[PDB]
mmCIF file of all heavy atoms in Angstrom:
data_model
loop_
_atom_site.group_PDB
_atom_site.id
_atom_site.type_symbol
_atom_site.label_atom_id
_atom_site.label_comp_id
_atom_site.label_asym_id
_atom_site.label_seq_id
_atom_site.Cartn_x
_atom_site.Cartn_y
_atom_site.Cartn_z
ATOM 1 N N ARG O 375 -37.988 17.168 -18.176
ATOM 2 C CA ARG O 375 -37.317 16.108 -18.936
ATOM 3 C C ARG O 375 -38.121 14.798 -18.846
ATOM 4 O O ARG O 375 -38.497 14.232 -19.872
ATOM 5 C CB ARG O 375 -35.858 15.941 -18.485
ATOM 6 C CG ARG O 375 -34.980 17.065 -18.992
ATOM 7 C CD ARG O 375 -33.628 17.122 -18.310
ATOM 8 N NE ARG O 375 -32.794 18.185 -18.886
ATOM 9 C CZ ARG O 375 -31.550 18.467 -18.507
ATOM 10 N NH1 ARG O 375 -30.975 17.784 -17.520
ATOM 11 N NH2 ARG O 375 -30.873 19.434 -19.108
ATOM 12 N N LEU O 378 -41.082 14.797 -21.159
ATOM 13 C CA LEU O 378 -40.660 14.583 -22.551
ATOM 14 C C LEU O 378 -40.200 13.149 -22.799
ATOM 15 O O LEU O 378 -40.679 12.499 -23.730
ATOM 16 C CB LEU O 378 -39.582 15.594 -22.959
ATOM 17 C CG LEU O 378 -39.875 17.061 -22.637
ATOM 18 C CD1 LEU O 378 -38.585 17.837 -22.471
ATOM 19 C CD2 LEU O 378 -40.829 17.710 -23.665
ATOM 20 N N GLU O 379 -39.360 12.631 -21.894
ATOM 21 C CA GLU O 379 -38.804 11.278 -21.915
ATOM 22 C C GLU O 379 -39.861 10.160 -21.635
ATOM 23 O O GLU O 379 -39.505 8.980 -21.605
ATOM 24 C CB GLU O 379 -37.588 11.208 -20.956
ATOM 25 C CG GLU O 379 -36.444 12.148 -21.337
ATOM 26 C CD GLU O 379 -35.295 12.306 -20.356
ATOM 27 O OE1 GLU O 379 -35.080 11.392 -19.528
ATOM 28 O OE2 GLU O 379 -34.579 13.332 -20.439
ATOM 29 N N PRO O 655 -12.577 29.176 -20.282
ATOM 30 C CA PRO O 655 -11.818 30.327 -20.802
ATOM 31 C C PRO O 655 -12.515 31.674 -20.944
ATOM 32 O O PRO O 655 -13.663 31.743 -21.383
ATOM 33 C CB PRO O 655 -11.306 29.826 -22.146
ATOM 34 C CG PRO O 655 -11.331 28.353 -22.040
ATOM 35 C CD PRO O 655 -12.550 28.067 -21.250
ATOM 36 N N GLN O 659 -13.904 37.217 -27.360
ATOM 37 C CA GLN O 659 -15.093 36.554 -27.904
ATOM 38 C C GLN O 659 -16.064 36.152 -26.777
ATOM 39 O O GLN O 659 -17.244 36.519 -26.855
ATOM 40 C CB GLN O 659 -14.746 35.385 -28.826
ATOM 41 C CG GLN O 659 -15.973 34.601 -29.346
ATOM 42 C CD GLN O 659 -16.950 35.392 -30.209
ATOM 43 O OE1 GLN O 659 -17.898 36.053 -29.732
ATOM 44 N NE2 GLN O 659 -16.813 35.223 -31.507
ATOM 45 N N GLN O 662 -17.671 39.328 -25.286
ATOM 46 C CA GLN O 662 -18.613 39.880 -26.268
ATOM 47 C C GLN O 662 -19.933 39.121 -26.237
ATOM 48 O O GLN O 662 -20.997 39.748 -26.293
ATOM 49 C CB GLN O 662 -17.999 39.857 -27.667
ATOM 50 C CG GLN O 662 -17.224 41.113 -27.965
ATOM 51 C CD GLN O 662 -16.403 40.948 -29.195
ATOM 52 O OE1 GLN O 662 -15.213 40.626 -29.127
ATOM 53 N NE2 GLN O 662 -17.022 41.129 -30.355
ATOM 54 N N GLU O 663 -19.846 37.770 -26.108
ATOM 55 C CA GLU O 663 -20.981 36.864 -25.996
ATOM 56 C C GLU O 663 -21.759 37.170 -24.704
ATOM 57 O O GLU O 663 -22.978 37.332 -24.775
ATOM 58 C CB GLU O 663 -20.509 35.407 -26.017
ATOM 59 C CG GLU O 663 -20.107 34.920 -27.396
ATOM 60 C CD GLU O 663 -19.458 33.555 -27.504
ATOM 61 O OE1 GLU O 663 -19.488 32.771 -26.523
ATOM 62 O OE2 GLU O 663 -18.941 33.260 -28.606
ATOM 63 N N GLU O 666 -23.527 40.374 -25.181
ATOM 64 C CA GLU O 666 -24.656 40.121 -26.079
ATOM 65 C C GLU O 666 -25.860 39.555 -25.307
ATOM 66 O O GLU O 666 -26.978 40.031 -25.513
ATOM 67 C CB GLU O 666 -24.236 39.200 -27.243
ATOM 68 C CG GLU O 666 -25.318 38.936 -28.292
ATOM 69 C CD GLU O 666 -25.003 37.914 -29.378
ATOM 70 O OE1 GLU O 666 -23.879 37.944 -29.931
ATOM 71 O OE2 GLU O 666 -25.910 37.122 -29.723
ATOM 72 N N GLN O 822 -23.053 19.818 -14.479
ATOM 73 C CA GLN O 822 -24.498 20.003 -14.550
ATOM 74 C C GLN O 822 -25.054 21.230 -13.803
ATOM 75 O O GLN O 822 -26.162 21.683 -14.117
ATOM 76 C CB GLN O 822 -25.237 18.704 -14.256
ATOM 77 C CG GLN O 822 -26.470 18.491 -15.146
ATOM 78 C CD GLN O 822 -26.212 18.205 -16.620
ATOM 79 O OE1 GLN O 822 -27.107 18.412 -17.461
ATOM 80 N NE2 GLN O 822 -25.016 17.688 -16.971
ATOM 81 N N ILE O 825 -24.720 23.676 -16.604
ATOM 82 C CA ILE O 825 -25.650 23.354 -17.691
ATOM 83 C C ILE O 825 -27.063 23.832 -17.359
ATOM 84 O O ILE O 825 -27.661 24.552 -18.164
ATOM 85 C CB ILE O 825 -25.573 21.857 -18.123
ATOM 86 C CG1 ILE O 825 -24.277 21.588 -18.905
ATOM 87 C CG2 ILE O 825 -26.785 21.444 -18.973
ATOM 88 C CD1 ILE O 825 -23.486 20.479 -18.412
ATOM 89 N N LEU O 834 -28.237 29.293 -22.726
ATOM 90 C CA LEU O 834 -28.434 28.154 -23.636
ATOM 91 C C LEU O 834 -29.344 28.470 -24.815
ATOM 92 O O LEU O 834 -29.133 27.949 -25.898
ATOM 93 C CB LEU O 834 -28.969 26.936 -22.887
ATOM 94 C CG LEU O 834 -28.108 25.689 -22.886
ATOM 95 C CD1 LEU O 834 -28.845 24.545 -22.237
ATOM 96 C CD2 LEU O 834 -27.739 25.275 -24.277
ATOM 97 N N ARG O 837 -27.358 30.906 -27.085
ATOM 98 C CA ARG O 837 -26.300 30.071 -27.651
ATOM 99 C C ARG O 837 -26.799 29.129 -28.764
ATOM 100 O O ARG O 837 -25.974 28.651 -29.538
ATOM 101 C CB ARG O 837 -25.585 29.283 -26.545
ATOM 102 C CG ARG O 837 -24.368 29.982 -25.954
ATOM 103 C CD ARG O 837 -23.682 29.104 -24.901
ATOM 104 N NE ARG O 837 -22.813 28.089 -25.495
ATOM 105 C CZ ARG O 837 -21.515 28.258 -25.735
ATOM 106 N NH1 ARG O 837 -20.909 29.392 -25.387
ATOM 107 N NH2 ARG O 837 -20.810 27.293 -26.316
ATOM 108 N N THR O 838 -28.130 28.881 -28.856
ATOM 109 C CA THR O 838 -28.754 27.994 -29.864
ATOM 110 C C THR O 838 -29.817 28.685 -30.796
ATOM 111 O O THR O 838 -30.294 28.063 -31.742
ATOM 112 C CB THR O 838 -29.368 26.755 -29.175
ATOM 113 O OG1 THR O 838 -30.420 27.153 -28.289
ATOM 114 C CG2 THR O 838 -28.353 25.925 -28.439
ATOM 115 N N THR O 839 -30.155 29.971 -30.527
ATOM 116 C CA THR O 839 -31.175 30.794 -31.198
ATOM 117 C C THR O 839 -32.561 30.188 -31.015
ATOM 118 O O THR O 839 -32.891 29.714 -29.928
ATOM 119 C CB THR O 839 -30.791 31.157 -32.644
ATOM 120 O OG1 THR O 839 -29.538 31.844 -32.633
ATOM 121 C CG2 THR O 839 -31.832 32.028 -33.341
ATOM 122 N N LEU Q 254 -23.544 20.822 -25.200
ATOM 123 C CA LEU Q 254 -24.290 21.813 -24.425
ATOM 124 C C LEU Q 254 -25.120 21.239 -23.235
ATOM 125 O O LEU Q 254 -25.137 21.823 -22.153
ATOM 126 C CB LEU Q 254 -25.191 22.639 -25.345
ATOM 127 C CG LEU Q 254 -24.575 23.621 -26.353
ATOM 128 C CD1 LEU Q 254 -25.625 24.117 -27.247
ATOM 129 C CD2 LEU Q 254 -23.974 24.833 -25.683
ATOM 130 N N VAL Q 255 -25.751 20.087 -23.408
ATOM 131 C CA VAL Q 255 -26.544 19.525 -22.319
ATOM 132 C C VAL Q 255 -25.826 18.521 -21.417
ATOM 133 O O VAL Q 255 -26.494 17.795 -20.665
ATOM 134 C CB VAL Q 255 -27.965 19.074 -22.738
ATOM 135 C CG1 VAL Q 255 -28.741 20.234 -23.354
ATOM 136 C CG2 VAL Q 255 -27.909 17.889 -23.691
ATOM 137 N N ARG Q 259 -29.863 12.748 -22.228
ATOM 138 C CA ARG Q 259 -30.802 11.959 -23.021
ATOM 139 C C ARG Q 259 -31.695 12.871 -23.896
ATOM 140 O O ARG Q 259 -31.838 12.602 -25.086
ATOM 141 C CB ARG Q 259 -31.647 11.108 -22.043
ATOM 142 C CG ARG Q 259 -32.570 10.078 -22.669
ATOM 143 C CD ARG Q 259 -33.308 9.326 -21.591
ATOM 144 N NE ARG Q 259 -34.577 8.805 -22.090
ATOM 145 C CZ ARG Q 259 -35.448 8.116 -21.354
ATOM 146 N NH1 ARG Q 259 -35.192 7.857 -20.076
ATOM 147 N NH2 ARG Q 259 -36.581 7.683 -21.892
ATOM 148 N N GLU Q 260 -32.250 13.965 -23.312
ATOM 149 C CA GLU Q 260 -33.123 14.925 -23.987
ATOM 150 C C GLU Q 260 -32.339 16.066 -24.613
ATOM 151 O O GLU Q 260 -32.027 17.062 -23.946
ATOM 152 C CB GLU Q 260 -34.347 15.363 -23.122
ATOM 153 C CG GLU Q 260 -35.257 16.476 -23.663
ATOM 154 C CD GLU Q 260 -35.824 16.480 -25.084
ATOM 155 O OE1 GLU Q 260 -35.396 15.649 -25.917
ATOM 156 O OE2 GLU Q 260 -36.680 17.351 -25.373
ATOM 157 N N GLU Q 264 -34.272 23.254 -30.805
ATOM 158 C CA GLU Q 264 -33.796 23.970 -31.994
ATOM 159 C C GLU Q 264 -32.403 24.539 -31.802
ATOM 160 O O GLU Q 264 -32.000 24.865 -30.691
ATOM 161 C CB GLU Q 264 -34.799 25.032 -32.503
ATOM 162 C CG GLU Q 264 -34.975 26.247 -31.604
ATOM 163 C CD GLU Q 264 -34.589 27.604 -32.169
ATOM 164 O OE1 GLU Q 264 -33.390 27.813 -32.470
ATOM 165 O OE2 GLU Q 264 -35.477 28.485 -32.242
ATOM 166 N N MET Q 265 -31.693 24.658 -32.898
ATOM 167 C CA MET Q 265 -30.354 25.179 -32.986
ATOM 168 C C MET Q 265 -30.190 25.629 -34.450
ATOM 169 O O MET Q 265 -30.161 24.792 -35.367
ATOM 170 C CB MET Q 265 -29.348 24.093 -32.600
ATOM 171 C CG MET Q 265 -27.919 24.495 -32.800
ATOM 172 S SD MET Q 265 -26.777 23.142 -32.474
ATOM 173 C CE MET Q 265 -25.378 24.010 -32.405
ATOM 174 N N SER Q 266 -30.141 26.964 -34.652
ATOM 175 C CA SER Q 266 -29.981 27.624 -35.942
ATOM 176 C C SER Q 266 -28.568 27.398 -36.481
ATOM 177 O O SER Q 266 -27.634 27.310 -35.679
ATOM 178 C CB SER Q 266 -30.280 29.116 -35.803
ATOM 179 O OG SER Q 266 -29.194 29.905 -35.343
ATOM 180 N N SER Q 269 -26.081 29.853 -34.948
ATOM 181 C CA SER Q 269 -25.653 29.445 -33.600
ATOM 182 C C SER Q 269 -24.512 28.437 -33.714
ATOM 183 O O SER Q 269 -23.471 28.619 -33.088
ATOM 184 C CB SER Q 269 -26.800 28.777 -32.843
ATOM 185 O OG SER Q 269 -28.063 29.354 -33.107
ATOM 186 N N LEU Q 273 -20.730 28.320 -32.224
ATOM 187 C CA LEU Q 273 -20.406 27.305 -31.210
ATOM 188 C C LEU Q 273 -19.167 26.477 -31.630
ATOM 189 O O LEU Q 273 -18.372 26.082 -30.762
ATOM 190 C CB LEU Q 273 -21.604 26.394 -30.865
ATOM 191 C CG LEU Q 273 -22.909 27.058 -30.380
ATOM 192 C CD1 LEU Q 273 -23.957 26.030 -30.085
ATOM 193 C CD2 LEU Q 273 -22.686 27.941 -29.149
ATOM 194 N N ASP Q 276 -16.462 28.636 -30.441
ATOM 195 C CA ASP Q 276 -16.520 28.555 -28.979
ATOM 196 C C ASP Q 276 -15.738 27.344 -28.500
ATOM 197 O O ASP Q 276 -15.052 27.442 -27.490
ATOM 198 C CB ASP Q 276 -17.981 28.419 -28.517
ATOM 199 C CG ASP Q 276 -18.714 29.729 -28.456
ATOM 200 O OD1 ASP Q 276 -18.041 30.787 -28.575
ATOM 201 O OD2 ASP Q 276 -19.968 29.704 -28.276
ATOM 202 N N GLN Q 279 -11.700 27.754 -29.356
ATOM 203 C CA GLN Q 279 -11.131 28.644 -28.325
ATOM 204 C C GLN Q 279 -11.103 28.007 -26.909
ATOM 205 O O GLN Q 279 -10.186 28.312 -26.137
ATOM 206 C CB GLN Q 279 -11.874 30.005 -28.289
ATOM 207 C CG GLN Q 279 -11.807 30.824 -29.602
ATOM 208 C CD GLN Q 279 -12.874 31.898 -29.765
ATOM 209 O OE1 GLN Q 279 -13.984 31.846 -29.191
ATOM 210 N NE2 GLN Q 279 -12.578 32.871 -30.620
ATOM 211 N N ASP Q 365 -24.674 41.938 -34.440
ATOM 212 C CA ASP Q 365 -24.071 40.867 -33.647
ATOM 213 C C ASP Q 365 -23.567 39.678 -34.406
ATOM 214 O O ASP Q 365 -22.605 39.057 -33.958
ATOM 215 C CB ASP Q 365 -24.946 40.464 -32.456
ATOM 216 C CG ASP Q 365 -24.652 41.309 -31.235
ATOM 217 O OD1 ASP Q 365 -23.548 41.136 -30.640
ATOM 218 O OD2 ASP Q 365 -25.495 42.173 -30.896
ATOM 219 N N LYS Q 370 -18.051 40.749 -37.333
ATOM 220 C CA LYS Q 370 -16.935 40.673 -36.412
ATOM 221 C C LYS Q 370 -15.692 40.066 -37.077
ATOM 222 O O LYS Q 370 -14.594 40.611 -36.963
ATOM 223 C CB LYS Q 370 -17.333 39.818 -35.171
ATOM 224 C CG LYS Q 370 -18.544 40.289 -34.336
ATOM 225 C CD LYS Q 370 -18.527 39.660 -32.923
ATOM 226 C CE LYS Q 370 -19.888 39.551 -32.255
ATOM 227 N NZ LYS Q 370 -20.271 40.721 -31.405
ATOM 228 N N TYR Q 371 -15.858 38.918 -37.724
ATOM 229 C CA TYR Q 371 -14.770 38.170 -38.314
ATOM 230 C C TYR Q 371 -14.737 38.342 -39.836
ATOM 231 O O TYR Q 371 -14.586 37.365 -40.581
ATOM 232 C CB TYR Q 371 -14.862 36.709 -37.808
ATOM 233 C CG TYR Q 371 -14.730 36.647 -36.294
ATOM 234 C CD1 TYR Q 371 -15.737 36.107 -35.507
ATOM 235 C CD2 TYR Q 371 -13.636 37.221 -35.647
ATOM 236 C CE1 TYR Q 371 -15.653 36.125 -34.115
ATOM 237 C CE2 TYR Q 371 -13.544 37.252 -34.260
ATOM 238 C CZ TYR Q 371 -14.547 36.695 -33.494
ATOM 239 O OH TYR Q 371 -14.406 36.739 -32.126
#
Side-chain angles (χ1 to χ4, degrees):
Chain O
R375 286 166 177 181
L378 311 154
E379 299 171 23
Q659 176 62 272
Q662 271 168 264
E663 285 172 13
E666 184 186 316
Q822 219 69 201
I825 287 128
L834 241 186
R837 269 182 81 92
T838 63
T839 302
Chain Q
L254 291 171
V255 303
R259 188 179 154 181
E260 174 49 350
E264 69 118 296
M265 174 185 194
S266 84
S269 323
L273 304 180
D276 278 349
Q279 299 160 335
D365 272 289
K370 301 199 205 269
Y371 299 121

